Write a protein that binds this ligand. Structure first.
Ligand SMILES: [Ag+]
Ligand SMILES: [Ag+]
Ligand SMILES: [Ag+]
Ligand SMILES: [Ag+]
Ligand SMILES: [Ag+]
Ligand SMILES: [Ag+]
Ligand SMILES: [Ag+]
Ligand SMILES: [Ag+]
Ligand SMILES: [Ag+]
Ligand SMILES: [Ag+]
Lengths: 466, 466
């Protein structure tokens, strides 16, 4: 009278995972604090091996040992409440797996505390949404390596299967390493969406393209280097019409939301001293678009240039394509530099070549762009920046002319390009052998006596500038 | 045998403050954990009323009550260690004042904990460097208002006197409001230093200007609307010669440092949901300046355009002046929108018109720019963005033409302008009644089923996009 794994939190995500685990031949117990949601699942699981429970004691006593408990409750304090109530009921060696979109610092705090009580805590990032959770998500579990191996086969059976037959799951590293990589991957998707949005803004407000030509443009781009799940979905979106045979994408209110992570990865980059300019401008861009009523009033008070393009539009369309691909490359270069620094500071010993399976960028499809990131770090693990990898190096040095043109016309025509500008600014700052920071060092030496180093002489110096 | 106020932490900042307090006629006790610096201060204070102590017990018993203890020790944990040791020796109503560059979150924690022991805590930001603390610093005290009034006469006597006679000290608000405003003010200074740096970069790299042409340019600008302490000193820095009459600022290693605050103010804006693009890009720009060796090898692998300017150099230099002024306005707009949001979330009831005395920007000189910031919020306290203030609004809408030319010329010439591009992008996005976030909402509605709103009809909607 025992089950092999239990799930707590029977919302859409937790219910779908329990069904996924069940469909592989595993006996699953379930529990929900409010009882109406757990017996609801019972009526939907008439043929499935799902054993409902209605108390925390019954749920824990229903699982074989070492117990494997998958936590799919609300992020934040509800998760801490579930762990705090489970802890006195658990036994030494049990495994708690938090599959929610947790801040990695909370995963580190819980994994450290429960380890003192001989309880394993695996923070697992889950990608795929409700659809993927049912059929096969991609998982980023982090925590005790021995606890992962005890549950590796369950995670392997329920995870997505790539083209190579490989499971979309691997051990990221200790404690909060899994939730961290999940956060950084989502932050990289933040940048890609903002760069695709900027590409659509120029195709619409500058080239005056229809929603038919816009959709066909992205589908063309998805066939080449820009092949990604986001580009493919973007093309289909511009083809879904509404009541009056109009593009529904244009009637959607332009206020972008975010459930954290975007804030989290930019805050982390600032803490690590990593320049995550493109992902941070993307998070800021979502902030600005939420002040919609404030923006509409500002539009009536702040004038700007009228967008005009008299030249060859289809060659400018290709320049936008090169600008999008290069800015995406700088996006990853910043994001993977962030991951390298984070593994150093957290002593995670991460393998960046193994952390290139981003979901929205073509995960199961084995997108060529992802394998190029993996191979770059695989061939040179000590690689300091993806911009210096021979492949990406060759592209950004040839595509920079297109990005500079696209940024220039965008600014001169009043169409904001926070992500495009960040990329060409990053490439120009990163490649600059000399920066005007020497002037900043001089000001800092005067105002706060912070001293300075020199380019010709060794040592540190202070100067009476006045 | 009791003094009126005590100082703990006898480095140069705390020793200068104690001397400042003494020079106004107050009896001062001093103490340092390691006694060696204490009885070095007796050797330097022969004629002044400085009573040294060598135990925390003696230091506490040497002060009249309610005791006024100014903390000037190492930021963070040395401060917490001094507080933890002081607490069992204090009495109800005693006032601890931390004058270090402290994260405002630490002040909120300390003020709440000490209040439960009937101990006042004042987090006080101090600006002006070491010479300022000796002759007259800028003070931003925050904490118990009744405790501020008990030390207000001492703070007013030692603080700098602006050129309208007023002492640059004022009660900012409860708990961490004082250190918070110091953090936001420093963040605004970060942006202005990076924008001045970008201005100098194009004067040299693009306009091929001299080092005395560059110097006289900043002094010319300091005579107009761009008058600030920063610009005036930037002109003096370019006049500092070395032994062989070379410009000394050209020899300083271009690695800009930072002691926090810049990180903190950008992390805070991300937490508040405030688009602080210009200040954050400047913080990231300092990060990029640190990887000097990495930048030097990147310069040998990543090519860019050769900077060249054919047109009127004087006409472009005036555009750089307009680009600098508008970008400065756009950073103040972000910085003061951030302060309004923080007063709301923290319940500080901040009067933004009284929080415009930024040190490096001309607070002691009562710069015309800072008074226009004060007048903007005095004339309209509910003002949501300084871009909407009639004075600033008429300047940004005229100067945008110059900023766009400066940004576009920089991108096409490979001179990185992260702050200039951020400002014009911030202006274009804030004035945009419609942004491409509608596409981001459609993508989110597909991947995570996050639903969306419409522009024409009210309600929430979810679409199957394929
Ligand atoms: Ag995979
Ligand atoms: Ag991932
Ligand atoms: Ag269409
Ligand atoms: Ag993935
Ligand atoms: Ag995958
Ligand atoms: Ag003042
Ligand atoms: Ag200040
Ligand atoms: Ag000179
Ligand atoms: Ag000031
Ligand atoms: Ag002042």
């Amino acid at each position: 009278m025992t089950q092999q794994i239990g799930v707590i939190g029977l919302a859409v995500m937790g219910k779908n995972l329990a069904w996924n685990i069940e469909s592989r031949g595993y006996s699953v117990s379930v529990f929900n604090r409010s009882s109406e949601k757990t017996d609801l699942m019972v009526e939907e699981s008439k043929g499935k091996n799902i054993h409902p429970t209605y108390s925390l004691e019954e749920f824990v006593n229903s699982l074989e040992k070492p117990r494997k408990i998958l936590l799919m409750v609300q992020a934040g304090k509800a998760t801490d409440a579930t762990i705090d109530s489970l802890l006195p009921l658990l036994d030494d060696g049990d495994i708690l797996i938090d599959g929610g979109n947790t801040n990695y610092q909370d995963t580190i705090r819980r994994n450290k505390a429960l380890a003192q009580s001989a309880i394993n805590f695996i923070g697992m990032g889950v990608s795929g949404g409700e659809i993927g959770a049912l059929t096969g998500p991609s998982l980023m579990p982090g925590g005790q390596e021995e606890a992962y191996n005890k549950v590796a086969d369950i995670l392997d059976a329920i995870a997505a299967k790539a083209k190579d037959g490989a499971s979309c799951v691997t051990y990221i590293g200790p404690n909060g390493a899994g939730h961290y990589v999940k956060m950084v991957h989502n932050g990289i998707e933040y940048a890609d969406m903002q760069l695709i949005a900027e590409s659509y803004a120029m195709m619409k407000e500058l080239l005056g393209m229809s929603h038919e030509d816009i959709a066909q443009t992205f589908k063309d781009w998805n066939a080449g280097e820009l092949e990604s799940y986001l580009i493919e979905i973007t093309g289909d979106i511009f083809m879904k019409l509404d009541e009056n045979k109009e593009a529904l994408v244009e009637k959607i209110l332009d206020t972008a939301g975010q459930k954290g992570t975007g804030k989290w990865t930019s805050i982390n980059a600032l803490e690590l001293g990593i320049p995550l300019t493109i992902i941070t401008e993307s998070v800021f861009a979502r902030f600005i678009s939420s002040i919609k009523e404030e923006r509409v009033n500002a539009s009536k008070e702040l004038n700007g240039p009228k967008a005009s393009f008299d030249g060859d539009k289809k060659d400018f369309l290709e320049k936008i394509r090169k600008a999008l691909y290069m800015s995406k490359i700088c996006s990853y270069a910043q994001g993977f530099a962030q991951m390298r620094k984070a593994s150093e500071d957290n002593e995670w010993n991460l393998k960046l070549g193994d952390l290139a399976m981003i979901w929205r960028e073509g995960c199961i499809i084995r997108a060529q762009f992802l394998q190029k990131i993996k191979d770059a770090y695989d061939n040179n693990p000590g690689l300091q920046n993806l911009l210096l990898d021979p492949y990406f190096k060759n592209i950004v040095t040839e595509y920079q002319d297109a990005l500079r043109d696209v940024v220039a016309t965008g600014v001169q025509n009043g169409v904001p390009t926070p992500g495009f500008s960040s990329s060409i600014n990053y490439y120009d700052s990163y490649r600059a052998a000399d920066l005007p920071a020497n002037l900043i060092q001089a000001q800092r030496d005067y105002f706060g006596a912070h001293t300075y180093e020199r380019k010709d002489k060794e040592g540190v110096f202070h100067t009476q500038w006045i």
